[PDB]
DNA sequence: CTGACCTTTGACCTG
DNA sequence: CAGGTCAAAGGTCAG
């Protein structure tokens, strides 16, 4: 499964198994520099049916379970 | 492109493509998320048979959100609120 | 309330 | 295993 949110993986993208909204997401907030605010705790649940509920939470999850910002490859 | 893309299977105004299951408008496609999202009820003051149509649709909000059901229309496929 | 207009998601695909 | 595409989810706010 997913490791940010155990939905099912496709694969290992950016050095995790990740499934395909977790893989698009990171390259998108990779790519574009996005910055992202918690309106709650930043504690948010990050799963598969609430991975969308807050950006901050989720890309922050990415990183701690490992996605590499530097497997996204320059412009 | 061409000006024809797609139609509204509810009222038969343009559209760009399917929502939640079903060609549909800007209209019908806000109009149901909207119905779902709040759980509204909707009476019809005639006879539950209302003709649905780009310049009649608002007149019966019953019979509208029963067409867009009857037409395909998954309430399932409208999600919870994001902010995201 | 409606509906025209804007942004993000993720399934699917190639290289 | 990367990055791009685009249908269909999300969203706002004048009228
Ligand atoms: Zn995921
Ligand atoms: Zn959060
Ligand atoms: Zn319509
Ligand atoms: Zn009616």
């Given at each position: 499964?997913?490791?940010?949110?155990?939905?099912?993986?496709?694969?290992?993208?950016?050095?995790?198994?990740?499934?395909?909204?977790?893989?698009?997401f990171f390259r998108?907030?990779?790519?574009?520099?996005?910055?992202?605010?918690?309106?709650?705790?930043?504690?948010?649940?990050?799963?598969?049916?609430?991975?969308?509920?807050?950006?901050?939470?989720?890309?922050?999850?990415?990183?701690?379970?490992?996605?590499?910002?530097?497997?996204?490859?320059?412009? | 492109?061409?000006?024809?893309?797609?139609?509204?299977?509810?009222?038969?105004?343009?559209?760009?493509?399917?929502?939640?299951?079903?060609?549909?408008?800007?209209?019908?496609?806000?109009?149901?998320?909207?119905?779902?999202?709040?759980?509204?009820?909707?009476?019809?003051?005639?006879?539950?048979?209302?003709?649905?149509?780009?310049?009649?649709?608002?007149?019966?909000?019953?019979?509208?959100?029963?067409?867009?059901?009857?037409?395909?229309?998954?309430?399932?496929?409208?999600?919870?609120?994001?902010?995201?």
């Open positions: 499964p997913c490791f940010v949110c155990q939905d099912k993986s496709s694969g290992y993208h950016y050095g995790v198994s990740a499934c395909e909204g977790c893989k698009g998108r907030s990779i790519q574009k520099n996005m910055v992202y605010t918690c309106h709650r705790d930043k504690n948010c649940i990050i799963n598969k049916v609430t991975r969308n509920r807050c950006q901050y939470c989720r890309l922050q999850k990415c990183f701690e379970v490992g996605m590499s910002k530097e497997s996204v490859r320059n412009d | 492109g061409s000006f024809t893309k797609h139609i509204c299977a509810i009222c038969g105004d343009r559209s760009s493509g399917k929502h939640y299951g079903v060609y549909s408008c800007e209209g019908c496609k806000g109009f149901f998320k909207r119905t779902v999202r709040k759980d509204l009820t909707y009476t019809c003051r005639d006879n539950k048979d209302c003709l649905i149509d780009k310049r009649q649709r608002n007149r019966c909000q019953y019979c509208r959100y029963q067409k867009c059901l009857a037409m395909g229309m998954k309430r399932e496929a409208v999600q919870e609120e994001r902010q995201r």
